[PDB]
Amino acid sequence: KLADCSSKSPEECEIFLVEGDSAGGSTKSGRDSRTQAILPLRGKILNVEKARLDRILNNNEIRQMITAFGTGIGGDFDLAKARYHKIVIMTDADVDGAHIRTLLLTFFYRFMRPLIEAGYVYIAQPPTGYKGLGEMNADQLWETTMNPEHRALLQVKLEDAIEADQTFEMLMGDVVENRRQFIEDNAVY
Amino acid sequence: KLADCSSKSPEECEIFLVEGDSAGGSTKSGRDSRTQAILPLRGKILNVEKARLDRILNNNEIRQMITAFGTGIGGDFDLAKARYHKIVIMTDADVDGAHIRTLLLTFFYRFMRPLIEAGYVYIAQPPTGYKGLGEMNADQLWETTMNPEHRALLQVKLEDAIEADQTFEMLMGDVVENRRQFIEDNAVYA
Amino acid sequence: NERNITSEMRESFLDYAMSVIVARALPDVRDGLKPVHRRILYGLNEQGMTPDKSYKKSARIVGDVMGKYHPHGDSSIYEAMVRMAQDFSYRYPLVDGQGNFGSMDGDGAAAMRFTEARMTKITLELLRDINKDTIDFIDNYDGNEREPSVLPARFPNLLANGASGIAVGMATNIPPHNLTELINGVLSLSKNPDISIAELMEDIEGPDFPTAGLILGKSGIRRAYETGRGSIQMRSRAVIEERGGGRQRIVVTEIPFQVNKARMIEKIAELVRDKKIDGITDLRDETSLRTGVRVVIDVRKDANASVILNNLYKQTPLQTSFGVNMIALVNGRPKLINLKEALVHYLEHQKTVVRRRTQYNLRKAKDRAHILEGLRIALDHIDEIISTIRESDTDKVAMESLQQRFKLSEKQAQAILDMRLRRLTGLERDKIEAEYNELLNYISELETILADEEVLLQLVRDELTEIRDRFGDDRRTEIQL
Amino acid sequence: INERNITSEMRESFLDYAMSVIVARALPDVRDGLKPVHRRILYGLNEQGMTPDKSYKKSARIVGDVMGKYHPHGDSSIYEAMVRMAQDFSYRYPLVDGQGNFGSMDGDGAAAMRFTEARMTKITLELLRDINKDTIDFIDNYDGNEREPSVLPARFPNLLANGASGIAVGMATNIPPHNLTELINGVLSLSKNPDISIAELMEDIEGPDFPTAGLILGKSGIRRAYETGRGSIQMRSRAVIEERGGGRQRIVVTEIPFQVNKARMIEKIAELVRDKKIDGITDLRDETSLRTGVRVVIDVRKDANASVILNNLYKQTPLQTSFGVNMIALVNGRPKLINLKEALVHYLEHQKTVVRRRTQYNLRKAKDRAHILEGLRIALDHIDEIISTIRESDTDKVAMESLQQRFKLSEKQAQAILDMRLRRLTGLERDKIEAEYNELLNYISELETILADEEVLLQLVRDELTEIRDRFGDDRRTEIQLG
DNA sequence: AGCCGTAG
DNA sequence: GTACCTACGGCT
DNA sequence: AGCCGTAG
DNA sequence: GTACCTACGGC
Ligand SMILES: COc1cc([C@@H]2c3cc4c(cc3[C@@H](O[C@@H]3O[C@@H]5CO[C@@H](C)O[C@H]5[C@H](O)[C@H]3O)[C@H]3COC(=O)[C@H]23)OCO4)cc(OC)c1O
Ligand SMILES: [Mn+2]
Ligand SMILES: [Mn+2]
Ligand SMILES: [Mn+2]
Ligand code: NA
Ligand code: NA
């Protein structure tokens, strides 16, 4: 599933995590194959906050990301072994895309935290006009979201580890009531 | 994939080979589950006349039919072990349905010939033309094609084995030229 | 530039949570619909898929809905349309399907390219008066279309067909109800705003499942109607009968709502195979389109069949609970509601719909009467009208001269100029006069309704009674005390 | 019907299928160069008003309407056929204008039909031009609820322009694409000489012209294909040898043969290197980008002969691929192996028929309009007596009969008078009616001149073809090198 | 070989 | 085309 | 512990 | 969101 880049110098290499093969094809055609890799996901990915370790380690999508990043996970994580110094989240420009992004960030925070701390995790900013990235032509996906000369990438920053720990547990954990209370308190209709 | 019948007395049991899962569901709802079994086929099936034995025996649709019939194949065929005394071909009343029927008959002639000779192979006659079997309601599929009181089944008959051998080899075999010559000679463009 | 993980998580998760709550998993209290079902039904109306017209291919219906209003996968649209066509899923089906639309055994429908659909007669009542400025239209997802925010819903559909939905931070589980009972309940509420839940339960006995069956007791129903939450015990319809030679059998003819018949049977077979139940000699599904649901459980000679049945209730879905959790969108916000609240919000929607329709009809009739007044002047002075037009070199000059000479408005002069010569015949002349006289009587009838809130409320009652008389049916589920 | 003989059943069911695949699936019509699925998509786009000036429509909506109205088959067959028509690497003159992921040369599929959008290209307007001018025969659709064209007017030679490939029953087809300037020039030359030879036609039509450009080795395969309808054409990638530094070299491939999957061709080169079936390759990279275009780099070992390596790659990989020409098309609803002249002759006959039918339609339409204007002229000249006749009439039928008898009018003329709006009575209308009528009489004589002289009609075909050539004709892409 | 492209 | 993977909550 | 039904 | 069969002809 991984459509890797030519270069083997991780400092200049970027990996784009897209939602499906519909966005994958566009991304593969539009990219700079020398420094940009594409990893198409399979829609909604496993929530590691609700899953046990055996299920996480057996999940094909989670495995594919670990293999592609080349760092290893948890206590065995090695930042020097990172295959890309830019891990770019490029989900579709819809509410489900926002959900996949939360699920991806949950996985990186709980299994690859030093990757966030090193500033390797990014969020792509595609235009609002199209929902599915498959709706976009390869040239417009390049110019607006992948071209380093014109793109606007958001570098994911970790400020407070205690606050982040509580945020991931509340939003993604098994306790429905704290999530329901968060919605009630912050919902703007 | 096989949605078998309650009865285990093959003399009164019938198996309907239906074109697609879309047709399967409605026939399973419309049938008499005591004596009528349903085996759906995922479109175009393997042409055994063009395929070698390993490919035939490794084919999922072919295996499912052998298992369902319970007779075995070729030299190991046993008519007394038939699980149904009626094997009904139920495809769409269109050109692709006609093709699936030729492919099914090719398989029965080359691997289960005594099944044809015993008069166990039938052809269902659903209402002719328009859209497929999935377009039909369960009650209309029952009344027109599955109900023994109103259905019109065609019993497949073998008259000349030499003629049938030549027919299957010409129409379904690997030699394109004899098939092309058959089309040219019999094609009526109207 | 930079983005804090905590801020990113809170914002992205709330955006998704909110969208699932107000725009996916929860039904609106007014029409009882989720966005996908509302878009299907509105789509069916826009495509002219009324019960009198022939069925249309499902893929064409789905493609239009997907493109115009619902930017999601076709399976979500198609499977939602399939559910609305199933008499075992919907207490009052909303879609009329042609082809394989699935079974109680969990068999899927045929591919959308094989099946065909149209509205049911009762769906006309959900859509009735939608183009009479009765409900608010909103912009679609891309701004290229308009879609209804809610349907007029001339029968109480939330409670009639029920709802089930898994959202974020919450879920919903509303059971279906009998339409005769519901409308009678709405009528009683319309005559007494202070009616109690207990009083409403004189009309609404409890849920009424499309699959019939039994409900054990009223305590679970009562708790659910009073608070919006309660556990309802559903039982299959099962009898014990002789089968010959002193042997007996259990015959199941109705199963609990949302229970897959094939999976319930396999669970019984599993229990027998694993010797977790004693006394069963055979298990057959004798169900047919011509006999209805018939599950036979043969009992061993001299074994107590009632003991076996009771064990089946304890160990299989033959007895299933329905966990009521009545969450619906009230003013675009999710809310746990009781029976009275659901009926109150529904009755308010109806009063608003009938008032708006009456206001729309008045404006249109007044506009048409104004045009007919112009046409009547033209017919009364047709020789002078023709001369005025003939002496004008342009359309603009004819317009201004007609307005000036005959004290006509721009709209009246335009209607006169658009008038065809065939409108000057005896029959066509009289048609204009007869339409105008009928319109004047219609205007006063509408003004009478708008001047008296009691007359308006009685019209809501009368229209609900009509729907009750036409679509109301017998109770299916037996509530055993 | 009781019994059925297996031999009779096999012969009838197989012929029914064989015939349907031949005349209604896998083979293109010689006239418009289309198979039923492609014709139904284009007709569908026209009926849905999906012209190049209008915004793109969601692919699922286009496909659903085509499936429901004309093509009772799977949506993937419809959608994937529409996708190919939108690919500039598949179609020499694309027929569909696509918005979104429509696939690549690496065999990547298009995005799901719910994501993509489409409309006609400007050249497709030329395939559909005059379809509603009684130029082609319409037939009943599959269920009798619709009407569909049996063939498109096809105002440019689309069979040869875009080519065709199809696997039928008992036969197949493989027609390569061609250059539109060359084809129209060839049609023009044929129109001035019915006895033109294939060799003479080849002065205009050099050979095939692939959307993927590249090279053709020699004219012998082209000549044989044009003379008989069958021949083998050697296609070569566009490859050069260049320096890369430190005395080292590389092979750079910028164009590949038609219908060759670039990713699959690269994997075959890698496989040869891995299995040591080729000597001298140190690296293999696909440097293709939207900016750079196709760029396949094959690094060569220092002091190794790069030309020897390139020649070995031509022999052992799809870097050199043959195009097996087998020009089978439907001619009078029957499959036929045709030569170049045959294909152009049937195309020119279709154009003569289309332009003649259009001129006949326009004449009938102008004669009908002139007849109506004559009625309106009378009504305006006696408007007071027309109004009185209508006013004294109780019904429409009575007004109709009275107008017909009193003013010597036909049923059509009386109806047009009764349908006339009051605004048509303004002062300058009588002059407009007179001016239109005088112009129409002139138009009628112009049309009658075309229909009376077959040379005038043939010159009009030539003129309209020249216009399309000037507007849509482009440069040759494939280089034909002398072997 | 296995691929081309309309079909189940 | 179909039965699969995934989120999500509340019943069992 | 796996199912209900809209979603990727 | 995904994976995977089959007919058919020619080279
Ligand atoms: C499983 O349920 C049935 C399946 C079928 C077959 C089929 C059979 C398959 C198989 C796949 C298919 C599948 O082909 C796939 O379509 C995909 C459609 O989207 C595009 C993007 O990609 C296509 C794949 O290239 C192709 O492989 C079906 C599509 O339409 C058919 O007729 C195909 O993989 C294994 O065996 C027939 C039936 O009854 C008639 C069935 O009930
Ligand atoms: Mn998506
Ligand atoms: Mn069919
Ligand atoms: Mn599909
Ligand atoms: Na989906
Ligand atoms: Na080669």
Numbering used by the authors:
A (entry chain D): 417 to 545, 580 to 639
B (entry chain B): 417 to 545, 580 to 640
C (entry chain C): 10 to 490
D (entry chain A): 9 to 491
Authors' description from the paper:
Bacteria have two well-conserved topo2As, DNA gyrase and topoisomerase IV (topo IV), which allow for dual targeting by antibacterials, affording reduced spontaneous resistance. DNA gyrase consists of two subunits, GyrA and GyrB, and functions as an A2B2 tetramer, as does topo IV, which consists of ParC and ParE subunits. Topo2As regulate DNA topology by creating a four base-pair-staggered double-stranded break (DSB) in one DNA duplex, passing another DNA duplex through this break and then resealing the break. As part of a structure-based approach to develop novel bacterial topo2A pharmacophores, we co-crystallized and determined structures of DNA-cleavage complexes of the S. aureus B27-A56(GKdel) fusion truncate (gyraseCORE) with QPT-1, etoposide and moxifloxacin.
In addition to the S. aureus cleavage complexes described, we also solved a 2.45-Å structure with a single etoposide bound. The DNA used for this structure was doubly nicked, with artificial breaks in the DNA backbone at both cleavage sites. We found that etoposide has activity against both S. aureus and Escherichia coli topo2As, through the stabilization of DNA-cleavage complexes, and that etoposide has dual-targeting activities for gyrase and topo IV. In our co-crystal structures of etoposide with S. aureus gyrase, the central hydroxyl of the dimethoxy phenol group of etoposide (ring E in Fig. 1b) interacts with the same main-chain N–H of Asp437 of GyrB as QPT-1. In contrast, in the S. aureus etoposide structures the equivalent residues, GyrA Ser84 and Glu88, do not make specific interactions with etoposide. Next, we examined the buried areas of our etoposide structures, to help explain why we capture cleaved complexes with either one or two molecules bound, and the observation that etoposide stabilizes both SSB and DSB. The CRsym complex with one etoposide bound has an area of some 1,653 Å2 buried between the two gyraseCORE subunits at the DNA gate (ba_ba'1–etop complex in Fig. 6g). All the CRsym complexes have either one or no compound bound and have a larger area buried between the two subunits at the DNA gate (1,625–1,744 Å2) than is observed in the other seven complexes.
